[PDB]
């Protein structure tokens, strides 16, 4: 029973990760923050100052 519950739990993790786009929310937020910082830094080259 415990082996079956563990296997079904892993399968449900797989399905939830696949279905929910925001499952990897922390990592995607980190990547987005870094990308936004880099894009802002690049854009400041376009500012006259």
């Amino acid at each position: 029973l415990i082996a079956n519950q563990f296997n079904s739990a892993i399968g449900k993790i797989q399905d939830s990760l696949s279905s929910t786009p925001s499952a990897l929310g922390k990592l995607q937020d980190v990547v987005n923050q870094n990308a936004q910082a880099l894009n802002t830094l690049v854009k400041q080259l376009s500012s006259n100052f």
């Binding site: 894009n39 690049v42 854009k43 080259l45 376009s46």
Partner: protein
């Protein structure tokens, strides 16, 4: 005109340094040159 070699290019006063490669991007007749996020020129149409 020099392609595929790092050269100093002055295309109607852009005055930049870089290597020129032929591009498949299509420019409409009115518009001359393209731009990137940094608003630095990423593609130029030859004047001649």
């Amino acid at each position: 005109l020099v392609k595929n070699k790092c050269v100093n290019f002055n295309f109607n006063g852009l005055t930049g340094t870089g290597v020129l490669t032929e591009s498949n991007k299509k420019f409409l007749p009115f518009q001359q040159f393209g731009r990137d996020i940094a608003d630095t020129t990423d593609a130029v149409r030859d004047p001649q």
